[PDB]
Amino acid sequence: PASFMTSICDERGQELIYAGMPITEVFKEEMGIGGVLGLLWFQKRLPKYSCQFIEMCLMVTADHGPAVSGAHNTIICARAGKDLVSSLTSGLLTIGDRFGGALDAAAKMFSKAFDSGIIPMEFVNKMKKEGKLIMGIGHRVKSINNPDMRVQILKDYVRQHFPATPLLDYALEVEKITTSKKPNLILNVDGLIGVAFVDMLRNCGSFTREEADEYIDIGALNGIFVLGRSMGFIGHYLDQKRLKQGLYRHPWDDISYVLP
Amino acid sequence: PASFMTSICDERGQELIYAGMPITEVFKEEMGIGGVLGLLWFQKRLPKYSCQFIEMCLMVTADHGPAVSGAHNTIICARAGKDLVSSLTSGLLTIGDRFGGALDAAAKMFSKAFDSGIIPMEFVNKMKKEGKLIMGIGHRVKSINNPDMRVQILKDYVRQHFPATPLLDYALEVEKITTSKKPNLILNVDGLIGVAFVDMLRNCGSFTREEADEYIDIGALNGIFVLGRSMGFIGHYLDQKRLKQGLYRHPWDDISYVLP
Amino acid sequence: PASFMTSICDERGQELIYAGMPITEVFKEEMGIGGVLGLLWFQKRLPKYSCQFIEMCLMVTADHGPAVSGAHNTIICARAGKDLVSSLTSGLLTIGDRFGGALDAAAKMFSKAFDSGIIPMEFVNKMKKEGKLIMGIGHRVKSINNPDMRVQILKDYVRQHFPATPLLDYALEVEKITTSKKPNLILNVDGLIGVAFVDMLRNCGSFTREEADEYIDIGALNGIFVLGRSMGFIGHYLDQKRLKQGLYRHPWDDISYVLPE
Amino acid sequence: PASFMTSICDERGQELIYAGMPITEVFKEEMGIGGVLGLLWFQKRLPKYSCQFIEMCLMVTADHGPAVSGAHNTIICARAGKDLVSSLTSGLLTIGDRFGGALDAAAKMFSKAFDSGIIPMEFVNKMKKEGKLIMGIGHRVKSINNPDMRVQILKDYVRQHFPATPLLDYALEVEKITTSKKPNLILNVDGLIGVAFVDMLRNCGSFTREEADEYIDIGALNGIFVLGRSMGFIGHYLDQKRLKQGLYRHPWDDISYVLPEH
To answer: How close, in Å, is residue D254 to chain A by CA atoms?
Structure first.
């Protein structure tokens, strides 16, 4: 009996196969990166609007500057003279909880609230009573009538092309309530990608509800952020090498030493 | 005085900027993933055929099955119950030398030969005399009589869209000479991506020769393989989680213990 | 205001300090690797038997061969021509759940049962009724009649030097109950290190119960396995380099390809 | 035919074996961590003074504060809410070149100079003429008449127990020359460990010269720094968790954004 099982790619034949589709057919059908992701991650031939949406998610998450945890760690690692893979990985390892984990957390929280049948106002008043933050809501500067253009771009695409967007509709009702009190409590990019990704899996027609719930549960949205942000982290590595930036050492004046 | 310097992304303003292009303009111009890569890695607005070529490279390198070093390690790590990032990274760390390093090695070797002015026959004779293998040449089963379809797809796109392909032309002449002696010494997918990527940087019009050479030197092609193959490794992680595969332990019958 | 806070090491003075102890005093007091770990991980000057016990844990977890997940991944990564750090890390990243996570899981499970006041027989019954495995119990070949020598070495040391071993005593009572039914349900090395490490934190006198519980909760035992097994993984890296082992590729005959139609 | 080969540890039998020594014998012989390292890394039963030296190396490299590249990255990773292994590894991945690479670089540079037969004065003038720094030399504050105490501890142990220290002797002659012009150009702890480790391998009696050279070449000294510093990095992870330190984001005022024009 075989010790390994695999479902995504077969390289043994005359031609490379991605989830049952020969590579020449992947190109003939113009599936793109989005469609290759649909085959390798989900073993589905996704509709073209789903492929393009996935590509849009990767584009909007590609980078968010050098100050965030992962980009900062990659930069330090490049400045210490390390190779591309080590530097990228040093940054990627910061991802999953407080940094880059909100896509997954927003998808789960909004799905749970929606599936439980609680209306948006009561979801908001419950989270306010329990003292818990709504994942995927809030921005430091952007506000209801000063939108995050990444959210706008995704939202226009999703609402036009998806057969339905019930979770996004629910999240937007939450946003109307939260922004009535504090204008900066908008549906942020992590919240938008999270809910729209659930809407894609649940309504594109390629998944049963059980499969959609499983892919969220095992971390498909963490995968999206990781693959997307890897573009920016490789870019930071290349940039630090070209800028001939030397070894970094954090300044002592920014560290409080509280030893016994 | 600032301790860090950065050139690729500015998130401080009203709108996210990738190398001077606001994110809304990235989408208006239909830049795609390849165009976002051009901005973040090279700080250039690349021509559309260059953007599509980059996307084709990522698609053909997305996965090559579960047996290769990195996929194997990712699978083991997923089967040990680890998270997506740890599992991906365990596989990525196998990349750069014997596994996934040939795109970079072929680009460098072919560029060095071409830039030195030596003709293809002279290059083959130089390597045969020095006992050194030509990187990007050779296949275990494909040959001049039985072509690799990923090579055919990439080669046809490049020859139909690029304004010039001198390094590819040079490598195809080397292939004619090597395959005349040993038919399995074809220009392989790593060799093709490597030389075609140099052709894109050198001839698309966005780079000086010094810039093109610098990007190859600091590891742009390692970046392409890593970003591309990350798609397949995330896919393997998700697959092992869905297949509910348990802890792996290598069989003792496949290990020779030669202790003192 | 400072953006970072740190408690373990001060390198700003002319002499390096580990948790309030100058490096010359660390050597003068013969604190060793175990005592340096006590300072850097716990900010305590631990008793000498605790320092030695920590060193014994690192020695028994140093390696368990090339077949386990992490050593295997390290070997593959070395055979792919990668550097020492990449190869080590590729293997370390397999640690924490099904591989190398049982020290932490056993410490937590036994501590929870002990702290709840349930007696060993009632803990075994509670787990059998809930269909949950007892972490740190069970071995493929070792038994009540064929002991695990790492367990024996650790247990012999602990009973000779620890002022009290209430959690190990509790775990050994659980072992008597499980081995009476099935001979192979022994207290294994992960179970032993896990409960003995809790006993050290709780009874050496350097920690309050709240501090001992916190160090277990934030992953001190994961740290022990990781630091210990890093010795073996670096050894595997060096070994593969000396053996001039070439690129590995898993055989197709050992893989079942179950792609869609 | 077997696809793998291994020399360091056999777990198949009744008792775990480290390079031919059963685990009960490892403890009965009081081998310690240094002796376990000698078995697993080198497949040798090293003399006790060599085992002790290895342990002293791990103790002196255990940590050097939170500001250095690797500790800083581990701290960031812990503050982002990640697990111990991810946080440790994020820091370890910074090691090998500009950070933590000087033990290996000093061992190789001093060995090459010594093996080539060039005298210490001529090695110093060559490096000045070529504009290359001597690896394992230099200290921000200690100097020839104000020694570094980690160097003093290790150097005394080495000279007191090793049967011969020709590379250390050569490095000390280099130090006398460098410090005659710039007092802080002392043999630092990376230089001391690097040359003393070569002296151990070459003179303890357990290795042939070919084996000693091979272990330096394949990265034994990188291994020492990595294993040693892992202790401090795990310590930083635990510390950040106890201090309940929140998500870090680097301040914009410390970053110069020089993007291409809009």
So the answer is: 10
